[PDB]
C-alpha cells in the first residue's frame, strides 16, 4: 500500500550476523545491465 | 535493538560521515567490513597510544570486533572474506601476531621480497585480492603503490553475492526519472510490489530487501527537507526497531559503482594518528618496528534484478 520511489540519493546497507559487508550513498546510478 | 553490532555501526556511520562531507556529489561505497578487519588486526599488533586511538575509533578491543566479523562472512557459499599479511624475509613476525592472522578466514602468512622485486610483489597481491574477488577487483594496489622501501603489507578482501528471496521481475524494469546531483537523468527502475519490513523515523525512510543466507539490505531514503542527508547510528538502530511488515510498491534503480580510496587522511581525522608515523607502536606484530605509511581501499558493489553483489579490500601498506 506504501509507495517507495528510490528517486533521488538514497543510502544502501549490506549487511549479515551484523557487520555491514557495503556502506553505499549512490547518488548517480550507472546502470550495469540487466541481470 | 538494531541489527548491526553497536561498536561497529558507529564506527562505520562515523566513518561514512566524514566520507561523504569530503565527496563533492555525497556518493560513497565502501566495506566497514574489510577496513574494520584490517584496522582491528593492526590493533591487535598495537600497543600504548597507537592502540588505544584504534580502539577509540573502532569503540571497542580487537578481539570481540574481529570474532564478530569472522562469523559474519562465514558459513555460506554466499560471501567469502580473506585476510594475509604479506612480509619482508627481514621482518621476524611474532607468534601471537601469526595467531591473530591464523584467525581470520582462509588467512595466510607470505613473504614479499619488496627490496628487490617490488613489481612482482604487486603482481602477486593483485592477483591474490583478484582471485578473492572473483575478479571484481583486479587492481587494489595502483602503479607504484608498491615501493622497495615498504616491509610488510596486510591485505583483507570480501566478496559477497546477496541473493533477492524474491528478485525483481525483469520485464518490469522501466526508465524513471532519478534526481542525481547534476540533475534530473532517465534511468532503469526495478519494479516490486510486495510484503517487506518497512519504517519511518525522522522524516527517514527505509525498506529492507530480503536475501539468502542472513544477507540483508536496507535502502534508505532521507527526508526530502535534505535530499542531502547521511544516517547516524541512532537513526539507523530507530528505523531497525521500527520496522514492520507493510505491503511496498519498490521502485529502485539498478545500479553499480566503484571507488578506490586513500583512508588515511581521514582515519586520522577520526582520531587515527600515530599509526601512520614513526612513533607508532606495532611491537606486538615484530620486534622490528613498522608503521603505516597509506591505507589502500576499494569498493565495488553491483544491484539488479537478481540481488546485490559486491567486492572489496582494504590493504596497509607497512614502512620500517
Same mark, same amino acid.
Given at each position: ?17 551484523? =557487520? ?16 | +535493538?538494531?541489527?548491526?553490532? !553497536? ?10 560521515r ?44 580487537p ?11 562465514? !558459513?555460506?557459499?554466499?560471501?567469502a ?7 619482508? &624475509? ?41 582471485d ?11 602503479? +607504484? ?18 541473493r ?36 519511518? &523515523? ?7 530487501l ?19 542527508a ?7 538502530? =530507530? ?29 586520522a ?29 576499494? =569498493? ?18 607497512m614502512?620500517?
Open positions: 500500500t506504501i509507495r517507495f520511489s528510490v528517486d533521488r540519493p538514497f543510502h544502501i546497507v549490506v549487511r549479515r550476523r551484523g =557487520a555491514i559487508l557495503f556502506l553505499g550513498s549512490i547518488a548517480d546510478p550507472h546502470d550495469p545491465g540487466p541481470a | +535493538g538494531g541489527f548491526l553490532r !553497536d561498536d561497529h555501526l558507529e564506527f562505520a556511520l562515523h566513518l561514512h566524514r566520507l561523504a562531507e569530503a565527496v563533492p556529489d555525497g556518493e560513497v561505497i565502501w566495506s566497514p567490513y574489510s577496513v574494520a578487519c584490517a584496522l582491528g588486526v593492526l590493533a591487535a599488533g598495537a600497543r600504548a597510544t597507537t592502540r588505544t586511538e584504534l580502539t577509540t575509533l573502532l569503540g571497542t578491543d578481539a570481540p570486533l574481529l570474532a564478530a566479523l569472522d562469523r559474519a562472512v562465514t !558459513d555460506s557459499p554466499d560471501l572474506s580473506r585476510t594475509v599479511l604479506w612480509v619482508s &624475509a627481514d621482518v621476524p613476525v611474532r607468534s601471537s601476531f601469526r595467531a591473530t592472522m591464523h584467525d581470520r578466514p582462509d588467512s595466510d602468512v607470505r613473504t614479499a621480497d619488496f627490496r628487490t622485486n617490488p613489481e612482482g610483489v604487486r603482481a602477486t597481491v593483485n592477483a591474490d585480492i583478484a578473492a574477488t572473483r575478479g571484481m577487483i583486479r587492481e587494489l594496489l595502483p602503479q +607504484g603503490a608498491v615501493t622497495p622501501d615498504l616491509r610488510a603489507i596486510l591485505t583483507n578482501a570480501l566478496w559477497a553475492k546477496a533477492w528471496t524474491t528478485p525483481f521481475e525483469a520485464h518490469l524494469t522501466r526508465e524513471g526519472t532519478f534526481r542525481t546531483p547534476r540533475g534530473p537523468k532517465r534511468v532503469p527502475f526495478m519494479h516490486r510490489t510486495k510484503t517487506m519490513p518497512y519504517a519511518t &523515523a525522522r522524516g527517514w525512510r527505509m525498506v529492507t530480503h536475501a539468502h543466507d542472513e544477507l540483508a539490505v536496507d535502502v534508505l531514503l532521507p527526508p526530502g527537507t535534505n535530499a542531502a547521511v544516517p547516524t547510528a541512532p537513526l539507523l538502530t =530507530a528505523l531497525h526497531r521500527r520496522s514492520a511488515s507493510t505491503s511496498v510498491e519498490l521502485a529502485l534503480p539498478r545500479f553499480e559503482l566503484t571507488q578506490p580510496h586513500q583512508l588515511v587522511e581521514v582515519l581525522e577520526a582520531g587515527v594518528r600515530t599509526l601512520f608515523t614513526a612513533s607508532a607502536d606495532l611491537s606486538g606484530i615484530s620486534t622490528v618496528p613498522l608503521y603505516v605509511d597509506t591505507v589502500i581501499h576499494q =569498493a565495488r558493489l553491483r544491484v539488479d534484478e537478481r540481488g546485490a553483489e559486491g567486492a572489496a579490500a582494504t590493504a596497509a601498506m614502512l620500517l
